[PDB]
Design a protein around this ligand. Structure first.
Ligand SMILES: *[C@@H]1O[C@H](CO)[C@@H](O[C@@H]2O[C@H](CO)[C@@H](O)[C@H](O)[C@H]2NC(C)=O)[C@H](O)[C@H]1NC(C)=O
Ligand SMILES: CCNC(=O)CCc1cccc(Br)c1
Lengths: 29, 587
């Protein structure tokens, strides 16, 4: 589904962003 | 002015405030730029009002009849309380909960209520962001999924737009009572909304500060694009004149003033306490006054800008329906009398009605003609979220680049909703830190409570919160903040610190404005709320497919149990202000 596939892409990039951001904080020492 | 013994020490001394800036680089956060603070505040305010509420009430009051009262209160009660909040946050170097604790020990309720109201409004505003992004996702198709029916009976009586909203998206039930399962495609979108919020409010103001560049600027760039296209639409400058033509009849209803009142505290993000915390991160010698005045100017301006853009599209669609309507009336006659196609026009309808009537009245009477009046099409207001999901989404389908016009419109509504959430998250996260992980606990706890809005009844549940959570509570908190800074902390003390901070004192006029009128105006809106609630029996609109006159407002009364939900949502936060005050006098 167009909405589903766009949703998936958005979710992926958002969660990846979140993961990078939390990891960035872990990196901050 | 009233007894406040030991107010000093509780609050930073003015002598110490110079020595509390260079040392407090660590353990409290700091704005990277001046613009990164101004942009954040602007985003939040404009993002909180123009996202849905403001554009709704404008079209629900017929324009001008709402804007005039709204603007009147925007200056008399808005500007004062926007200056007061920046100033008191920059002086006490504490968030909303700390400021009312420092000012007075038993004044905890104010900060607590501000945290509850900020939580409650942000709970159901992220559902609206979920709905907005549902449409955004479904906005990538040459045939927009709301442009045609799948014809189905409901979708026939309803519109291909009304069906997409009530059936394909909400799957709405007949009542708040009939509450079906968690609509799964709505849960995905809800998860997506609360997730991107966490992504942008992970460390608080530092991470959001880099979000508010695109988020506070896109709504504008796109709102200006929608003016140039807005005013090229046929019906624009018929609807704009309509917007500029207010009706005194609406003015003489206390409701119009109440809704205008409550919108000042929404369009200025006042009594949420997320602005106090924002200023609490400026330099102690930062000119909050200048800042408050600039914000008030940009707010009023953007509200009028939106109202114009909304009525442009309104006018266009209304004219579209007038011309389609009148075409059908032409078709009936031309058919029943086999007139040469195009012989009858708008120029010669009524004379050919009677003419053909005289020619053959028996063969004219059976003809049925609708009352195709353009003016009515403008006074045809939409209830709820319909201005974005029923009026704009339809008008977009009759505009070439419909898909672009769909994606631009739902990106600018997301951005507006997201920047609103940033300030709502600051008014719940900070009061918790004063009493990433905590952020996440709040981002997941709320997301779980957001499941009530993914039900079949989930749209009727949203209506209550929007009518109460964002209503009297804001006005009360707004009244108190004014009262507790002037009559508990002392306006005279407040004037000294103003001079210590901005380097000068407020104009006498502006002093008097927050001194008497603004407090007075809050009380007027308070009375208006009491009157409307008592004068009107609590009810709500339902969408029951397959009932007598299906495409009409069926306005059933809420069950007795809903009133319990109502007496709580509008009650609990406000009662925390007296409740805690009494509790502290007996501890
Ligand atoms: C001018 O304002 C009056 C305010 O009352 C409008 O009258 C109302 O219009 C709405 C929408 O058409 C109706 O739902 C109300 O019942 C009307 N109230 C009454 C009894 O007047 C009037 O329609 C407005 N005219 C225009 C051109 O917008
Ligand atoms: C999704 C909830 N929002 C609405 O219904 C209306 C929003 C809206 C419509 C047109 C211009 C602007 Br700016 C905002």
């Amino acid at each position: 589904s167009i909405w589903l596939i766009v949703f998936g892409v958005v979710m992926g990039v958002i969660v990846v962003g979140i993961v990078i951001l939390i990891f960035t904080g872990i990196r901050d020492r | 002015v009233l007894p406040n013994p030991g107010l000093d020490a509780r609050i930073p001394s003015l002598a110490e405030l110079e020595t509390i800036e260079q040392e407090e680089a660590s353990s409290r956060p700091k704005w990277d730029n001046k613009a990164q603070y101004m942009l954040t505040c602007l985003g939040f305010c404009v993002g909180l009002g123009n996202v849905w509420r403001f554009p709704y009430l404008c079209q629900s009051h017929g324009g001008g009849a709402f804007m005039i009262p709204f603007l009147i209160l925007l200056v008399l009660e808005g500007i004062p309380l926007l200056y007061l909040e920046f100033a008191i946050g920059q002086r006490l170097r504490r968030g909303s909960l700390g400021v009312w604790s420092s000012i007075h020990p038993a004044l905890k309720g104010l900060g607590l209520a501000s945290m509850l109201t900020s939580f409650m409004v942000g709970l159901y505003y992220n559902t609206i962001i979920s709905w907005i992004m549902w449409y955004l996702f479904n906005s990538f198709q040459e045939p927009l999924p709301w442009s045609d029916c799948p014809y189905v009976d409901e979708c026939a009586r309803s519109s291909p737009v009304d069906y997409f909203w009530y059936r394909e998206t909400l799957n709405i039930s007949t009542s708040i009572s009939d509450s079906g399962s968690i609509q799964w495609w709505m849960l995905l979108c809800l998860a997506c909304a609360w997730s991107v919020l966490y992504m942008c409010t992970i460390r608080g103001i530092e991470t959001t500060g880099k979000a508010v560049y695109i988020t506070s600027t896109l709504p504008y760039v796109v709102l200006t694009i929608f003016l140039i296209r807005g005013l090229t639409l046929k019906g624009a400058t018929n609807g704009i004149v309509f917007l500029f033509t207010p009706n005194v009849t609406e003015l003489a209803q206390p409701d119009t003033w109440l809704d205008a009142g409550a919108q000042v505290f929404f369009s200025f993000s006042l009594a949420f306490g997320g602005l106090i915390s924002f200023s609490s991160y400026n330099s102690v010698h930062n000119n909050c006054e200048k800042d408050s005045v600039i914000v008030s100017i940009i707010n009023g301006f953007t509200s009028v800008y939106v109202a114009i853009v909304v009525y442009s599209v309104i006018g266009f669609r209304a004219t579209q329906r007038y011309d389609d309507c009148f075409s059908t009336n032409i078709l009936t006659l031309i058919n029943g009398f086999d007139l040469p196609e195009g012989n009858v026009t708008q120029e010669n309808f009524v004379d050919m009605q009677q003419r053909c009537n005289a020619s053959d009245p028996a063969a004219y009477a059976q003809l049925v003609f609708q009352t195709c009046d353009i003016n009515a099409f403008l006074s045809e207001a939409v209830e709820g979220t319909g201005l974005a999901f029923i009026v704009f989404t339809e008008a977009i389908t009759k505009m070439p680049l419909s898909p672009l016009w769909s994606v631009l419109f739902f990106i600018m509504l997301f951005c507006l909703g997201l920047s609103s959430m940033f300030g709502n998250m600051e008014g719940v996260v900070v009061p918790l830190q004063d009493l990433e992980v905590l952020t996440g606990l709040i981002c997941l706890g709320t997301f779980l409570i957001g499941f009530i809005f993914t039900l079949n009844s989930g749209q009727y549940w949203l209506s209550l919160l929007d009518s109460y959570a964002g209503s009297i509570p804001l006005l009360i908190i707004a009244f108190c903040e004014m009262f507790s800074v002037v009559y508990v902390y002392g306006v005279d003390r407040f004037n000294k610190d103003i001079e210590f901070m901005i380097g000068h004192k407020p104009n006498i006029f502006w002093q008097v404005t927050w001194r008497v009128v603004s407090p007075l105006l809050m009380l007027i809106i308070f009375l208006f709320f009491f009157v409307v609630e008592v004068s009107q029996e609590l009810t709500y609109s339902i969408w029951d497919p397959g009932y007598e006159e299906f495409p009409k407002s069926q306005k059933i009364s809420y069950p007795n149990w809903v009133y319990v939900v109502v007496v709580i949502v509008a009650g609990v936060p406000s009662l925390t202000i007296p409740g805690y005050a009494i509790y502290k006098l007996i501890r």
